[PDB]
Amino acid sequence: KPVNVEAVRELAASGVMLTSDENVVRVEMNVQYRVTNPEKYLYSVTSPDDSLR
Amino acid sequence: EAIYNRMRAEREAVARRHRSQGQEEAEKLRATADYEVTRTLAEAERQGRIMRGEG
What separation in angstroms does the CA of A47 have from each of A3, A15, A27, A43, B50? 13, 22, 25, 10, 102
- A23 with B4: Cβ contact below 8 A: no
> Which resolution, in Å, applies to this structure?
3.3
Specify whether the CB–CB gap between A36 and A5 falls below 8 A.
yes
**Chain A residues within 8 A of B3 when measuring between CB atoms:** 22-24
CB proximity A24 to B under 8 Å = yes
Q: Is the dihedral of CA A36, A38, A43, A48 positive or negative?
A: positive
- How far apart are alpha carbons A5 and A32 in whole angstroms? 13
CB proximity B15 to A under 8 Å = no
Backbone angles phi, psi at A20, to 5 degrees: -75, -45
Specify whether the CB–CB gap between A31 and A10 falls below 8 A.
yes
CB proximity B7 to A under 8 Å = yes
Identify the burial level of A41 via C-beta atoms within 10 angstroms of its C-beta, where 0-12 means exposed, 13-18 middle and 19 or more buried: middle
